[PDB]
């Protein structure tokens, strides 16, 4: 069972602290052992382990932190969760999102960047609208296509918990989606 060190988990995050919970996987937190602020993002490497996976879901500052206290501290593997809207996803989102959620997906662009030039193993995740639904098992991983739509925060977490077993994230970007959910 390896390490997750998840960060902003107190949401997606809390979904996945479950899913991990559940599976009586070691996890280490910065709010199971609770751990922006270097110095405790650095502690929580260490306690994680250098075989750790990194599991965020968090602003730009947070995000390159973290990721360099990842690759300090010897830990290779990352997912990233943001936002569809997010690098070039963009000019798929509505000038009213835009307007609306612009700041917020820009900084997690600023994150997406950083981790795209670094050295981790990682896989993004570009989830919809967040719903709180309990999870069904019918979202999406979706790669070079435009997507519209929601996803309960728990089938995030399932996402998640599939990447995370998987040999390699292989620097992969998706679009997380389940077509027909309606809010």
């Given amino acids: 069972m390896t390490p997750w ?3 902003g988990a107190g949401g997606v ?7 991990a919970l559940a599976e009586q996987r070691p996890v280490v937190a910065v709010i199971v052992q609770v751990f922006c602020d270097a110095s405790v993002v650095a502690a929580a490497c260490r ?5 750790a996976l990194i599991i965020s879901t968090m602003d730009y500052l947070a995000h390159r ?13 990352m997912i990233l969760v943001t936002s569809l809207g997010c690098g070039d996803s963009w000019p798929f989102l509505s000038e ?11 900084e997690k662009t600023l994150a997406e960047s950083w981790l795209q030039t670094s050295q981790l193993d990682y896989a993004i995740l570009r989830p919809g609208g967040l719903l709180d639904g309990a999870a069904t098992g019918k979202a999406q991983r979706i790669q070079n296509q435009e997507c519209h739509g929601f996803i309960n925060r728990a089938d995030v977490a399932a996402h998640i918990h599939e990447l995370a077993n998987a040999p390699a994230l292989n620097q992969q970007v998706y679009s997380l989606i389940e077509p027909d959910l309606k809010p």
């Fill in 5 to 7: 060190l998840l960060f």
């Fill in 13 to 19: 995050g809390a979904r996945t602290l479950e899913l």
């Fill in 47 to 51: 306690a994680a382990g250098p075989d």
């Fill in 65 to 77: 932190t973290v990721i360099d206290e990842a690759e300090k501290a010897g830990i290779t593997r």
């Fill in 96 to 106: 009213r999102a835009k307007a609306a959620f612009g700041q917020a997906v820009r």
